[PDB]
Amino acid sequence: MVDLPVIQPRLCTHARWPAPVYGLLVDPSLPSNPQWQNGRVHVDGTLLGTTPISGSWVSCFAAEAAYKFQSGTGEVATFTLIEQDGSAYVPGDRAAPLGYPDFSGQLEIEVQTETTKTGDKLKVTTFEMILGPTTNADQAPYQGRVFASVTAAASLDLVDGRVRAVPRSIYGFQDTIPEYNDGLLVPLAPPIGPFLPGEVLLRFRTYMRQIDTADAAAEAIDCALPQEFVSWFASNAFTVQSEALLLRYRNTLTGQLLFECKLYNEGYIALSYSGSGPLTFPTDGIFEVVSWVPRLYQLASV
Amino acid sequence: MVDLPVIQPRLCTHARWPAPVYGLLVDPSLPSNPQWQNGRVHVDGTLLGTTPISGSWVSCFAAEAAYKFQSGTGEVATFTLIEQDGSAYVPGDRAAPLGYPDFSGQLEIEVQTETTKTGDKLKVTTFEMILGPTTNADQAPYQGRVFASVTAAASLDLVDGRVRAVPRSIYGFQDTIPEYNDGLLVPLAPPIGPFLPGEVLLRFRTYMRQIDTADAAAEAIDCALPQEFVSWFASNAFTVQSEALLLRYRNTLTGQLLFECKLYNEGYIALSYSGSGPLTFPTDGIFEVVSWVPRLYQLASVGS
Amino acid sequence: MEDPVTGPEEVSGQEQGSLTVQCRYTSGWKDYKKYWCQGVPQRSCKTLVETDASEQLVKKNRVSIRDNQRDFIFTVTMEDLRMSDAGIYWCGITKGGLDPMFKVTVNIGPV
Amino acid sequence: MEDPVTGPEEVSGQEQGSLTVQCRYTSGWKDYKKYWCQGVPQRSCKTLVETDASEQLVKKNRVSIRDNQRDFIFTVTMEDLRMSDAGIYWCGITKGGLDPMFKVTVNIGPVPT
Ligand SMILES: C[C@H](CCC(=O)O)[C@H]1CC[C@H]2[C@@H]3CC[C@@H]4C[C@H](O)CC[C@]4(C)[C@H]3CC[C@]12C
Ligand SMILES: C[C@H](CCC(=O)O)[C@H]1CC[C@H]2[C@@H]3CC[C@@H]4C[C@H](O)CC[C@]4(C)[C@H]3CC[C@]12C
Ligand SMILES: [Ca+2]
Ligand SMILES: [Ca+2]
Ligand SMILES: [Ca+2]
Ligand SMILES: [Ca+2]
Ligand SMILES: [Ca+2]
Ligand SMILES: [Ca+2]
């Protein structure tokens, strides 16, 4: 029978940005059927979209980096993507290498670099990389090819080599898929859904380090499941016996039931909620499996 | 019966530096009984040292940050530590808040900052923070207080607030515990061990982004278990039924047994290894539990 | 000139009037599409008008562009200026990967 | 002065000779311990000599330090210089948290011809 890790959401890892889960909420005002590509797993353990097993791969990429100074742009990186375990990336039935960012904006990335300049050798360099939604950089992670740059008055004298780019900050965040293939379609995990009438997506929320020259408001990003649930399902390879699982989210020290919900086999959780605005929930509960239920099982409202 | 997650080491997360696991090896030339404080878990699920559940907490810290410009130093951050879920840090029977770095050197950290300066507001700022082994900074994460700075000619005009510091690079890495309490001893997970004669620690290895002005060699850091094994034991809370666990590391496509090893209850894997130099292993195998065994169980040895 | 393209750092126009921007480039970029782009982030900026890599003048709504491929200068015009036209713009040259771009700040004076 | 402590950015001496370093500070740091540190990382440098916050001389091996708390200068003397003495050193003032420090590069060469 399916079970779930005994871990409070606040101790869990976000599945779309490398940070803790900080929030648990429903919000019917947000897009109902997001097409997130990370944090997507089937209850039978099948990874969907670009979802990786390891949280450390989330919103990162690995590449053979080649650098060239371009007067008036700076040092330009051409990244030939590989999978983050070092194996070759081959275009296939997903949008990009595992873990590749599945949102838009301009990302600051950090990579190890090596210079031939006298007096130093190894340092970490921050590059800027446009993700999407549309760009003039002709990004094609689906083809294993993306471009980044760093302002420089003159050449940094970098040595080409293998990198793993990790995210420093997002600028102009938009929760819409990035440019995966220079404007062309790619294979995608479908939109999250469907929901019964009155059901809404349960969101696990974290916040993204941000550049914003005017607004101090935090940048929220949601995912359908914590990363620990992804690796749990991928490891256990459960057999599914119906279309959804009835869960209870409970304080284990109080016994207080906070809500019941349905985990659809396709890897997203629904609550029955008719409110118009956000409803947040404590993050120190535990999800417990109750039973298999069919798609049409009707939940108690929150 | 106790079991392990069906995940290859190369798909796992490192437990002492936030990065993939890249290597799986033994090396008898290295310190045999390291006193790592992260990646430490009992088979019964008890987290040891400063080990957190989430890999995102590893080598990071959360704090209420207070900033003050100091001519000749730059912008100084006084970090009043909290736990990374936002809960209050309470000094107890571990060295520091969960996830706090357990190595030494000079760390570049990244935090969200907010400025009052005209024309911007939010950005990410890199601070330098001395970790250890000994420092003149009087770092005291055990007391919930550590200091960092960024060179600045004039104030950055930063607004005090909550941060989560994530690691950018290490400079002068040393795999020895940091200054946890201004040079005083703190509660620590014990040195990893003991090992039977002929047994050495099985190491999960990753590589740390580095500053080094002269040497291009990669900076290795080892841990006793991938982070997925930590959260697995903490989640399952298995019952201990003898002294140790016999494991097999196997290629699951070919069936090839690569070696057998012992997972001691206290959270580290021993391999019986008779060579003198390092020996690496393929990282696309799977660890499987065979049996409970006594501590004195003699493993089949792996040679040169 | 080492940069592929350069322009005026700042340009000013009056509400209801026009302004002109000369995006000067180097000869190798002759047979490339030229464009005028609006906003940030830089490389997701909104193209307002673009050439087809010939010297044909193009106008789209209030923005015109023409590439002089003898002197290697493409000239942008913005007319009937509105206060909301103020902001960050870019001279751009279309190529594979990262386009050469030059940041032009536009200021609008009222009445 | 506005920086708490300043030293010579570069100081050069010769084999078997001596050199001195003046670590000048502002008056508020009068009653603090002063020290001379060696190496990098900066804030784990090796302390070679440290005063007791008085004007009393301290000497260890070839290194001396003397705080003058009237002119607000602590002077460091390094004697019988050796090529291996060359490197990064620091003027330091001991305080809780981040010490005021100033980077001094020490260069050593043979006496010419
Ligand atoms: C930027 C930080 C993320 C660090 C990252 O992990 O890398 C996070 C940590 C906790 C977050 C705050 C949580 C409470 C508040 C929530 C509210 O809905 C928005 C504001 C609020 C103050 C958040 C702001 C962003 C914070 C400070
Ligand atoms: C810097 C990267 C870490 C980024 C991190 O994920 O953040 C890692 C990716 C894999 C690593 C290489 C692995 C192969 C080699 C191993 C050998 O023992 C050392 C050299 C070798 C060529 C490594 C260098 C460091 C690399 C490039
Ligand atoms: Ca394109
Ligand atoms: Ca914003
Ligand atoms: Ca001290
Ligand atoms: Ca090194
Ligand atoms: Ca382009
Ligand atoms: Ca101090």
Amino acid at D95: K
SS3 (DSSP) at A205:
strand
- Are the beta carbons of C99 and A171 separated by less than 8 Å? no
DSSP secondary structure letters along B184-250: -----PPPS----TTEEE-EEEEEE-EEBSS----EEEEESS-HHHHHHHHHH-PPP-SSEEEEEEE
**Backbone angle region of C28, left / alpha / beta, with phi > 0 → left and psi within -120 to 50 → alpha:** alpha
- Are the beta carbons of B137 and D45 separated by less than 8 Å? no
Within an 8 Å CB–CB cutoff, is residue A133 touching chain C? yes
Pairing of strands A122-132, A104-114: antiparallel
Resolution (Å) of this entry: 1.8
The domains located in chain B, with CATH, are 8-57+172-294 (2.40.510.10), 58-171 (2.40.30.120)
DSSP secondary structure letters along B68-120: EEETTTEEEEEEEEE-TTSPPP---SSSSSTT---SEEEEEEEEEEEB-STT-
CATH number at residue D108: 2.60.40.10
Domain range enclosing C38: 1-111
Tell me which DSSP letter residue A190 carries: P
SS3 (DSSP) at A149:
strand
Listed in sequence order, the residues at least 6 apart from A60 whose beta carbon sits closer than 8 Å to its beta carbon are: A18, A84, A99, A100, A164, A165, A166, A167
Distance CA D45, CA B180 (A): 18
Report the C-alpha dihedral over residues A82, A85, A87, A89, rounded to 10 degrees.
-30
How far, in Å, from the CA of B206 to the mean position of ligand 2? 8
Q: Which helix (H) or strand (E) holds A228?
A: helix A227-236
Distance from CA of B267 to the nearest CA of D (A): 32
Using a CB-CB cut-off of 8 Å, the residues of chain B touching D89 are: none
Query: Which residue lies with its CA nearest to atom 23 of ligand 2?
Result: B218
DSSP secondary structure letters along B254-303: T--EEEEEEEETTS-EEEEB--SS-EE--SS-EEEEEEEE-TTPPPPPB-
SS3 (DSSP) at A123:
strand
Q: Are A141 and A97 in contact (CB under 8 A)?
A: yes
Q: Which helix (H) or strand (E) holds B150?
A: strand B145-150
Distance CA A132, CA A179 (A): 5
For residue B173, with 0-12 CB atoms within 10 Å meaning exposed, 13-18 middle and 19 or more buried, which class applies?
A: buried
Structure tokens at A245: 């699982």
Beta bridge partners of D107: D12
B5 closest CB neighbour out of A6, A52, A231: A231
How far, in Å, from the CA of B187 to the mean position of ligand 8? 23
Distance CA A170, CA A196 (A): 34
DSSP secondary structure letters along A229-266: HHHHHHHH-PPP-SSEEEEEEE-TTT--EEEEEEEETT
End-to-end CA distance of chain D: 41
Structure tokens at B16: 């002492």
With a 6 A CB cut-off, is B278 part of the ligand 2 pocket?
Answer: no
Distance from CA of C20 to the nearest CA of A (A): 22
Amino acid at B300: A
Breaks (C-N over 2.5 A) in chain D follow: none
Within an 8 Å CB–CB cutoff, is residue B50 touching chain A? no
The whole-angstrom distance between residue A38's C-alpha and the CA centroid of its chain comes to 4
Phi, psi of B235 (to 5 degrees): -75, -45
What experimental approach yielded this model? X-ray
- Largest distance between two CA atoms of chain D: 48
Structure tokens at B49: 């040292």
Distance CA B224, CA A258 (A): 38
Distance CA A248, CA A253 (A): 14
Within an 8 Å CB–CB cutoff, is residue A41 touching chain C? no
Using a CB-CB cut-off of 8 Å, the residues of chain A touching C45 are: 136
Q: C4-26: buried (b, 16+ CB within 10 Å) or exposed (e) per residue? A: bbbbbeebebeeeeebebebbbb
- Are the beta carbons of B171 and D92 separated by less than 8 Å? no
SS (H, E, C) A47-60: ECCCCCCCHHHCCC
Chain D nearest-CA residue for B173 = D41
C98 closest CB neighbour out of A73, A105, A106: A73
CB atoms within 10 A of CB A151: 10
End-to-end CA distance of chain A: 27
How far, in Å, from the CA of A163 to the mean position of ligand 2? 8
SS (H, E, C) chain D: CCCCEECCCEEEEECCCCEEEEEEECHHHCCCCEEEEECCCHHHCEEEEECCCCCCCEEECCEEEEEECCCCEEEEEECCCCHHHCEEEEEEECCCCCCCEEEEEEEEECCCC
CA distances C98 to A75, A147, B178, Å, are: 11, 7, 43
CB atoms within 10 A of CB D77: 17
Judge if the upstream peptide bond of residue C41 is cis by omega within 30 degrees of 0: yes
Judge if the upstream peptide bond of residue B91 is cis by omega within 30 degrees of 0: no
- Are the beta carbons of A124 and B108 separated by less than 8 Å? yes
Structure tokens at B159: 């607004």
Query: Which residue lies with its CA nearest to atom 19 of ligand 1?
Result: A218
Cα dihedral A128, A134, A139, A140 sign: positive
Within an 8 Å CB–CB cutoff, is residue B121 touching chain A? yes
Using a CB-CB cut-off of 8 Å, the residues of chain A touching B120 are: 213-214
- Touching chains, A (3+ CB pairs < 8 A): B, C
CB atoms within 10 A of CB B213: 14
CB atoms within 10 A of CB D103: 14
The number of distinct structural domains making up chain C is 1
- Residue A205 CA, closest ligand 1 atom number: 18
Question: From the CA of C33, which ligand is nearest?
Answer: 7
Amino acid at A226: P
Radius of gyration (C-alpha) of chain C in whole angstroms: 13
Chains A and B physically touch (3 or more Cβ atom pairs below 8 Å): yes
- Are the beta carbons of D100 and B73 separated by less than 8 Å? yes
Restricting to A residues 137-156, those with a Cβ less than 8 Å away from any Cβ of C are: 137-138, 147, 149
